[PDB]
């Protein structure tokens, strides 16, 4: 049962690992958007402004 | 790509401004050349008038 129970741990790790895949990309998306939401914004006031 | 996209569009501004500043500066001096050229030619009419 220990080996069988361990299989559920590695299987459940896929959920945490899968969530980290989307969480890492989703969290990184904020950095990319923030770098562009502020850089272009400051430049928009200089170019468009 | 997001960072390069901003730099790509922002690089055109620095290149356009650097290229436009050369034309804008020459455009302002163009009026002086025409004004000075016309003023010199107009001086002949003044002396004749």
Curated annotation (Swiss-Prot), chain A:
Free-text comment on this protein's domains from its UniProt entry: The rodlike tail sequence is highly repetitive, showing cycles of a 28-residue repeat pattern composed of 4 heptapeptides, characteristic for alpha-helical coiled coils.
Whole-protein coverage range: 1667 to 1715 of 1960
Function field: Cellular myosin that appears to play a role in cytokinesis, cell shape, and specialized functions such as secretion and capping. Required for cortical actin clearance prior to oocyte exocytosis. Promotes cell motility in conjunction with S100A4. During cell spreading, plays an important role in cytoskeleton reorganization, focal contact formation (in the margins but not the central part of spreading cells), and lamellipodial retraction; this function is mechanically antagonized by MYH10. (Microbial infection) Acts as a receptor for herpes simplex virus 1/HHV-1 envelope glycoprotein B.
Oligomeric and partner information: Myosin is a hexameric protein that consists of 2 heavy chain subunits (MHC), 2 alkali light chain subunits (MLC) and 2 regulatory light chain subunits (MLC-2). Interacts with RASIP1. Interacts with DDR1. Interacts with PDLIM2. Interacts with SVIL. Interacts with HTRA3. Interacts with Myo7a. Interacts with CFAP95. Interacts with LIMCH1; independently of the integration of MYH9 into the myosin complex. Interacts with RAB3A. Interacts with ZBED4. Interacts with S100A4; this interaction increases cell motility.
Family note: Belongs to the TRAFAC class myosin-kinesin ATPase superfamily. Myosin family.
Tissue: In the kidney, expressed in the glomeruli. Also expressed in leukocytes.
UniProt-annotated location(s): Cytoplasm, Cytoskeleton; Cytoplasm, Cell cortex; Cytoplasmic vesicle, Secretory vesicle, Cortical granule; Cell membrane
List of residues that carry Phosphoserine: 48
Organism, scientific name: Homo sapiens (Human)
PTM sites of type N6-succinyllysine: 3
Name of the molecule in the record: Myosin-9
């Amino acid at each position: 049962q220990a080996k069988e129970n361990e299989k559920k741990l590695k299987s459940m790790e896929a959920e945490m690992i899968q969530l980290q895949e989307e969480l890492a990309a989703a969290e990184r998306a904020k950095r990319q958007a923030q770098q562009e939401r502020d850089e272009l914004a400051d430049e928009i006031a200089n170019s468009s402004g | 790509i997001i960072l390069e996209d901003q730099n790509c569009k922002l690089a055109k501004e620095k290149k356009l401004l650097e290229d436009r500043i050369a034309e804008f500066t020459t455009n302002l001096t163009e009026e002086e050349e025409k004004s000075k050229s016309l003023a010199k030619l107009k001086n002949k009419h003044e002396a004749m008038i």
